[PDB]
Amino acid sequence: VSVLQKHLRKLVPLLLEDGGEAPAALEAALEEKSALEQMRKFLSDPQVHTVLVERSTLKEFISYNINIDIHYGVKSNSLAFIKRTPVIDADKPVSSQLRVLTLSEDSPYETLHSFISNAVAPFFKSYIRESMAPSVEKKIAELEMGLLHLQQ
């Protein structure tokens, strides 16, 4: 709700843009009643984890709408805010019990392939070096090759 709006203001602007807070487009997106209900559901219910806030630029106007679902719009610079806690509590940890995933303005196929190659497979490699994991790594390699083939 308000906590989710503050988290998206203090996180997505530092992720989607070069840094800052929720702009007029971002504030207007968060100001929608349905978007506010989606933010409240994400910050309260445990079922809703990923929270998407987009700083779009449609031919380069600053006018965006926030929603629970994530879609590949026209230059939609979405930012997936996956929450780990069941709720975003004001006293208990919320952002530490969450994460920020950056999505490209265009379709996320190439960025997702790069993330699988160098942020999912490398993370699994680091975890294994610190140590079903090899099966996960091989399946991630196969899925990254398939995603590259599909994007191409």
Binding site: D89, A90, D91, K92
Partner: protein, 242 residues
């Protein structure tokens, strides 16, 4: 400084209680006896966290934090702990985790031992459903008893060489394997029936219980086919002799 110390102590106690409750000892972890032991360990961890929170030092620290305006910290520690849930779970799983019918079925790889162990697993599921143990927990106990009976039958068959037995020995081994599979299925059904009784007692929460059975019937069918084929081989040897 002291108010922050009390609030941080409350928050750390809440985090420790949440970590203790996070290790869910489900029936999938091992057999039915393994699930009962995991539930007992989780309940013991929850009870220890609750005792640490309710100790006089914990109460004094909580009072100091509340007097220091750390109401948010106290509320976070209370919500993240789940001490009441842990104590209730320990009380509920105490009368269900104590029974060991799955281990009895595993030890009794034979037909009568498998039937007795499956009956013990079903009775443990019924007792857990009578207690605060879940209907899914009782069904998992029955399923673990059936799986242990099937594994014990397979291990005994491997030890005795029932697949390569003689005529009468192979017939008895196939009968024993089929009986072990059937006893495991019956014990899984009994555990599912106890879980269904628990779910009927908790119709708002307990949606249903699985069919459980065992984890064999295919081995028993193959052994019966082998015994019939050995009888046919003897009859055909007699026919060729004639």
């Amino acid at each position: 400084t002291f108010l922050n110390q009390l609030q941080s102590g409350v928050n750390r106690w809440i985090r420790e209680i949440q970590k203790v409750t996070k290790l869910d000892r489900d029936p999938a972890s091992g057999t039915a006896l393994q699930e009962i032991s995991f539930w007992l360990n989780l309940e013991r961890a929850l009870y220890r966290i609750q005792e640490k929170r309710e100790s006089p030092e914990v109460l004094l620290t909580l009072d100091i934090l509340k007097h220091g305006k750390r109401f948010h910290a106290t509320v976070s520690f209370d919500t993240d702990t789940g001490l009441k849930q842990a104590l209730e779970t320990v009380n509920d799983y105490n009368p269900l985790m104590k029974d060991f019918p799955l281990n009895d079925l595993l030890s009794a790889t034979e037909l009568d031992k498998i039937r007795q162990a499956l009956v013990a697993i079903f009775t443990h599921l019924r007792k857990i459903r009578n207690t605060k143990y879940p209907i899914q927990r009782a069904l998992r106990l029955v399923e673990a008893i059936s799986r242990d009976l099937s594994s014990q039958l397979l291990k005994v068959l491997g030890t005795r060489k029932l697949m390569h037995v003689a005529y009468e020995e192979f017939e008895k081994v196939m009968v024993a394997c089929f009986e072990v599979f059937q006893t495991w299925d019956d014990e899984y059904e009994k555990l599912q029936v106890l879980l269904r009784d628990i779910v009927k007692r908790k119709r708002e929460e307990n949606l249903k219980m699985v069919w459980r059975i065992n984890p064999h019937r295919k081995l028993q069918a193959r052994l019966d086919q082998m015994r019939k084929f050995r009888r046919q081989h003897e009859q055909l040897r007699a026919v060729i002799v004639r």
